[PDB]
Design a protein around this ligand. Structure first.
Ligand SMILES: Nc1ncnc2c1ncn2[C@@H]1O[C@H](COP(=O)(O)OP(=O)(O)OP(O)(O)=S)[C@@H](O)[C@H]1O
Ligand SMILES: Nc1ncnc2c1ncn2[C@@H]1O[C@H](COP(=O)(O)OP(=O)(O)O)[C@@H](O)[C@H]1O
Ligand SMILES: Nc1ncnc2c1ncn2[C@@H]1O[C@H](COP(=O)(O)OP(=O)(O)O)[C@@H](O)[C@H]1O
Ligand SMILES: Nc1ncnc2c1ncn2[C@@H]1O[C@H](COP(=O)(O)OP(=O)(O)O)[C@@H](O)[C@H]1O
Lengths: 581, 571, 97, 96
């Protein structure tokens, strides 16, 4: 008994237990089960990192401090470990002499000992080798007779496929559900626990670093549960500052939310850290920073930058994505380019744009590729194309390209992402679109968008295109769109400004090779004859570097006069261009 | 006073320190993890180098020298005792009284001194130290591998509340450089051992080029100590010695299981006259169309100039299929890898299913079979060495055409689950099976610079102008004549010679006798596939008819005759 | 109970320092029978050495044939030496060369 | 390996190692040499294609006709590792 079971009650007299704050409805319900006549076995069902191990450490602190009823007064909470019972059990019945050694020491205790079996699912099928199980089949009489007082603490899905499968052991435990606390309920958890970390780290932790250790944990960390990550963050931040005082008021020890969001940005990647950066320079110039790489399209950025300012002010709907856009209009105008800009603004990486082409979803059978296959079908455990991608990046700009080429029954899949920000996978797991920006480019009115842009100034392309030919006949999808955005086609004013960032990002490395080129002003309209298109758009400009500028170097090698090291020009003549050394 | 007392004042008295060089942003991480109280147990995971030696020697350096005052220093911790645990203890249970006595009586001063434990994976990894770890006794520094971590330390649940994966990334060549910078404190003052600059790097460059299944620094510290053991024992083997340290000391140590000397292990600036005439041009005198990729398109790749996100070493090479592609993708791998492992062939010829979505560059969800999928899905996860082919893409209906544009540009690097794919060391040979099928007849007046501009100018841009608008360099493989295959039909017969001299028959064949085969030999449709069965049906199946009949006795060389309507070589 | 330490006793020569070892044994029997004993394989590092070649074991057979020519009173001929190394390498697969 | 086309296509990857190298890895990781076995695969993939062979198909073009039907069922890396694809003719009146 003293070889296996850790005694939590004498670990509470030394003050070695964490102070437990709250939990008084789940501790009282635990004592209500622990005082039952038969089957006095609570199982603290929760999720990993909810506090179900620090409920019995708030029961064992309670027995010593005496807030338990008489009947649980003066008990002992022993923490049996089923990993130390299957530890060296090689031979036949070395495990069964460990339980029947522990179970017979618990009967000498005449009911003065509470047994905390943490992770009961490790008891289902312990020393099971021969046949019939040996741990939750040896406890099974003394669990039903109300004899050993077994506080279990498993999680809900580990209860579901370990303990619920043994239906004769499932009834010997009573589910004391430990729901995770809310964001305000874990501040008081962490306000009293902060001094137990101040005495260990020799680090002062402010309640600003605690009110933001939980609002940033809950919002940004979605796989963990709340009083496990909020105390991870303060322990990581107090260890990050504990370097700054050891090795090399301005050499601080205080944790503030500057250090808490810095650890969380180092965990997840979301840079909302401090507004003492150029973010004050960035929050009102949010519409013109997009204009750095989205040339023109003032109706486009004033729809997307005003919607992502609407949520950074905490004013947008938290049961809806950050933005739901329909980018109908011409091709090669700034549709796909703004979403790269919007990803390079919000999550500052244009690799965080989940592009989905809806020409792959032409027919109705190809809708379970986005959402996932049902149980029992091909591609079930794989997932969906949209739902699993949003589980990869929950903070991403979803591009749904040419949605008018989808099936009509894929807008039905796209009614719940727009309205509620949810999409359930084929495996019954719901993915959360509340942090994504769902932008949907289309070409459904583009014939009438292009002809009327220099006629109807800035608002009449929105009205009166809807109803004769365009989307109103299927009306449930239009009103779920946040802003329907029409795109004015590009004149010569924009493609001269759009054809300047072709090699601007590669510009900052390749100087010493022998290349630095300033703007030449004579070959401007050579690219503005194939690239500046009223019909097909500005996308043939990207081929107008692959067809116009890059050809007579990489194949004209063998003739023996043109060798690299000299910067090329282009002039308006019938030249078949030369290059002088 | 023997077992559980280790004094760390001795480490400067004896010089028992092997200094760590290179790891500081991956060791101060294991001081961030260790300084916590939730999950304050760093387990060091990966390739070697740290192993509780970086935090203990990088601890006395900041206290005894004296830049910081004494009001801040005092973080004096200790290290592992592991040696006398199992040894010297006899009974069952009286071995256990030594392990319970080593943890409980270090608590004589109420936590005045703290202690780390090192290398905890064996089970002492959670059978006798598990209450000693759950009681909040003291915190330890683990060291596992990655796969032995997921054997023991993570499919548990009570142990990752204290441990966490600390991964170290694969180290430099400068790991053993500074191992021999400090260690001349022990080498030259008493033995006068020099090891030069090209002799430290020589036993360490063996990873990215030579062999890539094994870690670097385990193969670096051992192959220097064996090369440095040269003097005192080769003088006791019953102008005198090169005291100028060269590549020779490691080569005796390294090449005692390969057989390849120094001559191609340090391919350098002047060595590229020597790496032209080694193995490519002794099996076959020829195959010099593909030598351009190692001559003019090699200057901006192997001098620290390989930019992966635009094709610079991608020299385009065309031809037919089954005609010399698969041998050169092996013979260039034979010119590089000293062996045969390049097995790549991609064709889009005779399969009509909906499985052509996964053969592109991977499968997005909604499919079957991700484990194989396409061939290139698996050809980087196997090993990063493969030479990618592209054949017969020109036939299917035009909805499938333009997906070849996405990979060759700088848009997105296109991996599949988060680890990298190959962009730097691959030559792509593709296959053009347009109207170069009637041209295989004669070898008289074949075009090298009349072929691709006037024949291709009027036939390409009627149906599809988006295919040869990018790709322009067209030069043909060998035309299938007589004597150029008479070399190739000698290669497949000389492996029939070695198949036959094992039983005592040396067969000759004439220039007249193997062009007897050429009427039933090659195919313009399949390439040189029906060459091998033509050896079986014409000579080899009649040969085994005569070896078994006993009328071809071993020892006597036989000649042939021209005879009646079935052509066999009889007496 | 207290026994099972034939190799454990040896290690009190490693406490002396006098214990020394050149492990040349079966490899996978070196894995699972030196399982829990890290004090028997402290830093014994992986340096390669195994079976030879067909022409390497012809030199093995050519010097060992005098022990087999005198045990059997036969005359093992040098074709039979080369054919014993080539054919056993080719055909027998479970055995080593 | 008779009725070979009824096998699941993950058995042809196991069978391919036999025709590639002669080796085949046991599920315990043992290497088994097949270099002295004769591996025959009986199939009837081109079943209703050889029933019309009596007109103008004397086993030269008929070999390439069934290797069109078979190439729709076996991988091209599998068929080239087969030494000899043999097409059986239907039995005439004089064979019965
Ligand atoms: N109400 C609470 N009051 C004080 N500390 C708490 C409270 N809830 C949780 N904690 C602490 O936060 C952490 C939560 O971990 P646990 O209590 O083990 O929860 P858990 O459900 O057992 O997680 P796992 O995955 O089962 S180990 C521990 O460090 C607790 O001390
Ligand atoms: N409004 C715009 N602002 C900035 N760049 C633009 C704009 N419109 C077009 N471009 C340029 O045109 C190119 C269009 O390429 P592509 O993505 O193939 O077209 P599309 O966006 O229609 O798919 C982009 O690389 C981009 O640089
Ligand atoms: N970065 C490095 N700095 C100093 N020594 C190193 C470094 N990397 C490797 N080594 C040397 O390599 C050897 C690795 O051996 P070891 O630490 O026993 O392996 P493992 O860490 O797998 O137990 C050490 O002796 C060490 O001296
Ligand atoms: N240098 C060469 N010239 C001509 N034919 C060759 C050469 N090297 C190899 N071959 C032939 O290629 C054949 C294999 O080609 P094939 O099976 O059609 O393509 P793959 O091997 O890519 O499947 C071999 O039989 C061999 O005779």
């Amino acid at each position: 008994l003293k070889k296996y079971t850790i005694d939590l009650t004498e670990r509470a007299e030394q003050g070695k237990l964490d102070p437990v704050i709250g939990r008084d409805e789940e501790i009282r319900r635990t004592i209500q089960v622990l005082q039952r006549r038969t089957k006095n076995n609570p199982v603290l069902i929760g999720e990993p990192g909810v506090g179900k191990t620090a409920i019995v450490e708030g029961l064992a602190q309670r027995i010593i401090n005496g807030e338990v009823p008489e009947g649980l007064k003066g008990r002992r909470v022993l923490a049996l470990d089923m990993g130390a019972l299957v530890a060296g059990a090689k031979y036949r019945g070395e495990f069964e002499e460990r339980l029947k050694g522990v179970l017979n020491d618990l009967a000498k205790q005449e009911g003065n000992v509470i047994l905390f079996i943490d992770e009961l699912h490790t008891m289902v099928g312990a020393g099971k080798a021969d046949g019939a199980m040996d741990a939750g089949n040896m406890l099974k009489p003394a669990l039903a007779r109300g004899e050993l007082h077994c506080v279990g603490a498993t999680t809900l899905d580990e209860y579901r496929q370990y303990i619920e499968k043994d239906a004769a052991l499932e009834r010997r435990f009573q589910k004391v559900f430990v729901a995770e606390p809310s964001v305000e309920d874990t501040i008081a958890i962490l306000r009293g626990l902060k001094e137990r970390y101040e005495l260990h780290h020799h680090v002062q932790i402010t309640d600003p670093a605690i009110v933001a250790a939980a609002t940033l944990s809950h919002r940004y960390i979605a796989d963990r549960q709340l009083p496990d990550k909020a105390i991870d963050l303060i322990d990581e931040a107090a260890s990050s500052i504990r370097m700054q005082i050891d090795s090399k008021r301005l050499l601080r020890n205080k944790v503030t939310d500057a250090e808490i969001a810095e650890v969380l940005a180092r965990w997840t990647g979301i840079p909302v850290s401090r507004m003492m950066e150029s973010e004050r320079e960035k929050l009102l110039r949010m519409e013109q920073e997009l204009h750095h790489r989205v040339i023109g399209q003032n109706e486009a950025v004033d729809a997307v930058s005003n919607a992502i300012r609407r949520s950074r002010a905490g004013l947008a709907d938290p049961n809806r994505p950050i933005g739901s856009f329909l980018f109908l209009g011409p091709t090669g105008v700034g549709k796909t380019e703004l979403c790269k800009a919007l990803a390079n603004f919000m999550f500052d990486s244009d690799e965080a744009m989940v592009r989905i082409d809806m020409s792959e979803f032409m027919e109705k059978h190809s809708v379970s590729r986005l959402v996932g296959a049902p149980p029992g079908y091909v591609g079930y455990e794989e997932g969906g194309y949209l739902t699993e991608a949003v589980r990869r990046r929950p903070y991403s700009v979803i591009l749904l390209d040419e949605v008018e080429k989808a099936h009509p029954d894929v807008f039905n899949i796209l009614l719940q992402v727009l309205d509620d920000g949810r999409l359930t996978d084929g495996q019954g797991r719901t993915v959360d679109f509340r942090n994504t920006v769902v932008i949907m480019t289309s070409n459904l009115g583009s014939d009438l968008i292009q002809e009327r842009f220099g006629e109807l100034d800035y608002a009449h392309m929105k009205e009166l295109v809807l109803g004769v030919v365009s989307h109103n006949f299927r009306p449930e999808f239009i009103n779920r769109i946040d802003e329907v955005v029409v795109f004015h086609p590009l004149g010569e004013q924009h493609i001269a400004s759009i054809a300047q960032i072709q090699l601007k990002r590669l510009y900052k490395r390749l100087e010493e090779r022998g290349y630095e080129i300033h703007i030449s002003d004579e070959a401007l309209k050579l690219l503005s004859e194939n690239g500046y298109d009223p019909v097909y758009g500005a996308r043939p400009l990207k081929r107008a570097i692959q067809q116009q500028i890059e050809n007579p170097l990489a194949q004209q090698i063998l003739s023996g006069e043109l060798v690299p090291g000299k910067v090329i020009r282009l002039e308006v003549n019938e030249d078949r261009i030369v290059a002088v050394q």
